[PDB]
Design a protein around this ligand. Structure first.
Ligand SMILES: [Mg+2]
Ligand SMILES: [Mg+2]
Ligand SMILES: [Mg+2]
Ligand SMILES: [Mg+2]
Ligand SMILES: [Mg+2]
Ligand SMILES: [Mg+2]
Lengths: 274, 274
C-alpha cells in the first residue's frame, strides 16, 4: 500500500543497475582489495551504489540507507525502525571480475526492523527475483515455493567459503562443511553470491543455505524472498534471525534449519551495528 | 566430413535427452543409491541412456559405446581406437533429484583414443556447449575462449566435494580446498556437475577445474570443449591427461594447471579401464 510504489521504483533501479553491470563486464576492470586479498571491489560497485542511493534519496528523502560501499567509505550503520534501504550494488564482485555468470543487485527494504520487500536481480542470467510480505515470492513471473525436504540426510545445501583468508576462520568454515558432509547430506553447492544462493532455496532448487561472515546487505533482499516462498530464516545458533549478526540459516523448514544449527561451530565476528 | 554427421546427430540426441529430463523434473522421483548414500540414480538416468544407446546403435551400428549406467549394470569398459561414444545420460543426478538448475547430458566422441567432438547440454538453462577438434568451442553459437589469468593468486577455481562419505577421502578433499584457499586464490565454486564445471572453464568464467573420483563419461564431452576454447587438460599430478584415470585438472593454461597440481594430495581410486 504505501510501500508498493517504493518496490515498483526499486525494480526499475535494479534493472538500471543490471545494465551498468553488464556494460562494465564488456570492458577492462581495475580491481581493488578491501578487508582481504579475496575481498574485491571495482569502480562499478561504487558507481552502481552512488546511482541507487542518489535515486532513492531524491524520490524518498525521509528514508534511511545502508550500502556495502558506503560503509567501506566510512559511513556508520545505525539500524532503526525507520523505512530503510539495504543495498548491495554488486553481490558477487569476485564473480563479476571473473565473468562467472552469477552477479546480482540486491535491494532490501525494512520497516520496524522487519523485511518489507526485497529485490535480487541476477543480471547476467536476467532473472528478477522479488518478495514482499504477505504478497509472495517470484522469479520472472513464476511464483516461488521452497522444497518439502525436512530430512538432512536427503538435503542439498548452498554455502560459500568466504573472502576471509584468516587461518582459523578458514579452518572453521571447512570443518563445518566436513561435519555436514559426514551426517551425510546429498551435497554442497556454491554459485558465489549470498543473494542468488538464498534465491535457490526460495525456488526449491536447494533445501537450505547457511553462512557466517556475510553482511546485512547480502541478505536483506533475499531474506523476504525465502520466507515468502514458505521458508524460514534463523541464526546459526538456532535463535531468532538477526540481520546485523553476520550469520544466517535460510531454509525450507524449521526442522532442517535447527538440524544445520546443531552442526555449526560459530566464527567470532564483529556485528554490522557494533 | 563423416564425424560432422555424428556431431550433428549427437546434438539432436542431447536435445531429445534434455526434453526427457525436463519432463521427469515435473514429476515425483524414486531415488536409488549406487556406491554411496550420495551416489544417486533414477529411472530417468536409465531411460535416457537406453534412448541414447539405441539411437546411436541404429544410426552407427559399427561404433562403440561406453555409458555410466551400462557400466553400473555390469558392462566392462574396453577402450579401443574404434569410433567410441562416451555417454553420461544425466551428469548431476543429485541436482536433478533436487531441481538444482544445472543438469547436463554429456556425449563425448573419440576416434583413435582421441577426443573428436563433445556435446554438453545444460538442459534446464538451455545451454548447448559443443567442441570439435580444430573447429572451436561454442555455447549456443557464441565462440568460447578460456581466461588469460596465469597467476593462481588471482584465480577462481571450480571443484566438487564428491559422492564419497568415507572419512579419509572427505578429509583429503577438504584439506586440498584449504591448501588452495590459503595460497590465497580468489575463490572456489561448485555447481554440482563435472561437465558444466568444465564448460565454465571453457567460457573463461572460471580459470580452472580440478577433481578426483569422476569418470571418463564425466569428462569426455567437456574435455574437447576446454581445449578448443584454448585450455589444457592434465592429470592431478602434473602428468599427461588420462581419460580412464578418474582425475583431472581442466585449466586455462599449463602454468595454472601445474600450480594447482603442486597443492593436491591424491585419493586412491580404481581406474575406469581396470
Ligand atoms: Mg557487493
Ligand atoms: Mg554481497
Ligand atoms: Mg563486496
Ligand atoms: Mg551418477
Ligand atoms: Mg550421470
Ligand atoms: Mg556425471
Amino acid at each position: 500500500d504505501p510501500w508498493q510504489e517504493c518496490m515498483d521504483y526499486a525494480v526499475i533501479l535494479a534493472r538500471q543497475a543490471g545494465e551498468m553491470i553488464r556494460e562494465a563486464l564488456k570492458n577492462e576492470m581495475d580491481v581493488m582489495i578491501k578487508s582481504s586479498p579475496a575481498d574485491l571491489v571495482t569502480v562499478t560497485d561504487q558507481k552502481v551504489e552512488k546511482m541507487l542511493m542518489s535515486s532513492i534519496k531524491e524520490k524518498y528523502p525521509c528514508h534511511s540507507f545502508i550500502g556495502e560501499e558506503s560503509v567501506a567509505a566510512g559511513e556508520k550503520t545505525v539500524f532503526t525502525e525507520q523505512p530503510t534501504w539495504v543495498i548491495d550494488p554488486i553481490d558477487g564482485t569476485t564473480n563479476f571480475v571473473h565473468r562467472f555468470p552469477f552477479v546480482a543487485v540486491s535491494i532490501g527494504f525494512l520497516v520496524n526492523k522487519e523485511m518489507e520487500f526485497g529485490i535480487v536481480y541476477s543480471c547476467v542470467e536476467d532473472k528478477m527475483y522479488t518478495g514482499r510480505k504477505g504478497k509472495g515470492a517470484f522469479c520472472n513471473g513464476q511464483k516461488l515455493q521452497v522444497s518439502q525436504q525436512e530430512d538432512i540426510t536427503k538435503s542439498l545445501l548452498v554455502t560459500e567459503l568466504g573472502s576471509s583468508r584468516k587461518p582459523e576462520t578458514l579452518r572453521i568454515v571447512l570443518s563445518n562443511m566436513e561435519k555436514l558432509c559426514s551426517i551425510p547430506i546429498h551435497g554442497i553447492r556454491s554459485v558465489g553470491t549470498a543473494a542468488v544462493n538464498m534465491c535457490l532455496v526460495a525456488t526449491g532448487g536447494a533445501d537450505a543455505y547457511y553462512e557466517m561472515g556475510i553482511h546485512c546487505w547480502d541478505m536483506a533482499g533475499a531474506g523476504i524472498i525465502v520466507t515468502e516462498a514458505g521458508g524460514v530464516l534463523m541464526d546459526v545458533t538456532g535463535g531468532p534471525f538477526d540481520l546485523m549478526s553476520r550469520r544466517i540459516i535460510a531454509a525450507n523448514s524449521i526442522t532442517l534449519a535447527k538440524r544445520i544449527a546443531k552442526e555449526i561451530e560459530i566464527i567470532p565476528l564483529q556485528r554490522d551495528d557494533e
